Amino acid sequence: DLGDVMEMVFSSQGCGSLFVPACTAEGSYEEVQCFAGDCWCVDAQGRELAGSRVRGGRPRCPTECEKQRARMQSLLGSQPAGSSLFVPACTSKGNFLPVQCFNSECYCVD
Amino acid sequence: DLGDVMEMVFSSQGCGSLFVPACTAEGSYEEVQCFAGDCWCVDAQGRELAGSRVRGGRPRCPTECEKQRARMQSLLGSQPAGSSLFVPACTSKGNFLPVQCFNSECYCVD
Numbered sequence: 001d002l003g004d005v006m007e008m009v010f011s012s013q014g015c016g017s018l019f020v021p022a023c024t025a026e027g028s029y030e031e032v033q034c035f036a037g038d039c040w041c042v043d044a045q046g047r048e049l050a051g052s053r054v055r056g057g058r059p060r061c062p063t064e065c066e067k068q069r070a071r072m073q074s075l076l077g078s079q080p081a082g083s084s085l086f087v088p089a090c091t092s093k094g095n096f097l098p099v100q101c102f103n104s105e106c107y108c109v110d
Numbered sequence: 111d112l113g114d115v116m117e118m119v120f121s122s123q124g125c126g127s128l129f130v131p132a133c134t135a136e137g138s139y140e141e142v143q144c145f146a147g148d149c150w151c152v153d154a155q156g157r158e159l160a161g162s163r164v165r166g167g168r169p170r171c172p173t174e175c176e177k178q179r180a181r182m183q184s185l186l187g188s189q190p191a192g193s194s195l196f197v198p199a200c201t202s203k204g205n206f207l208p209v210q211c212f213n214s215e216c217y218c219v220d
Contacts, residue, residue: 036147036165036166037165056147
C-alpha cells in the first residue's frame with residue numbers, strides 16, 4: 001500500500017564486491033568492517049560512517065565526547081553571529097578534557 | 111655552486127611507508143608498482159602517473175594512441191574558439207581506431 005511506499009523511500013535515504021561483513025556472536029554487526037585493505041566503522045544497521053574509513057589500518061570508532069562534539073557543532077551552525085552555544089572538548093583519543101567552560105564558568109567533569 | 115642549486119630545484123618539480131619498489135632484471139623500474147592493495151604505473155624515474163592508480167587491481171599502462179590523445183588534447187585547449195586540431199581516437203584497450211578523420215578527410219591507419 002501507499003504507506004509501505006512511504007516507509008521504503010524513508011528507509012532508502014543513504015543507500016548504495018566480494019565484501020564479507022563480520023558479525024558478532026549475538027548476530028549484530030561488528031562495528032569495524034574491512035575489505036581489500038580498507039577499514040571503516042558501522043552503525044547498528046551496518047552503514048558506514050562518513051569519516052571512519054582508514055586505509056592500511058584499523059580505525060578507532062567515535063566515542064561519547066566525539067559524538068556530542070559533532071552534534072553540538074551541527075547546531076552552532078544555526079545560532080546567530082557572535083553567539084556561543086556549548087561545545088565539549090575532546091582529546092585525540094576521544095576522552096573528555098578535564099575542564100569544561102561556558103560563559104566564563106568552568107567545571108571539572110568526569 | 112649556484113648552477114647546482116638551479117638543477118636541484120628543476121629536478122624537484124613533482125616530488126613527494128614500507129613500500130618496496132619492484133625492479134627489472136636490467137635494474138629499471140617495473141612499470142607497475144603496487145603497495146597495500148593499490149597499483150599504479152610509473153615512468154623511467156619511477157614517478158607515479160596522474161590517473162594510473164587503481165584499487166584492488168592491476169592497471170593497464172598508457173599506450174601510444176592514449177599518450178598522443180592526451181598530448182593533442184592539452185594543445186586543443188590553446189587553439190581559438192571554433193577551431194579544430196587533429197586528435198586521434200583510441201579504443202578502450204588503447205589501440206587506434208581503424209579510421210581517422212580531419213577537416214572532412216578520412217584515412218585508414220595501422
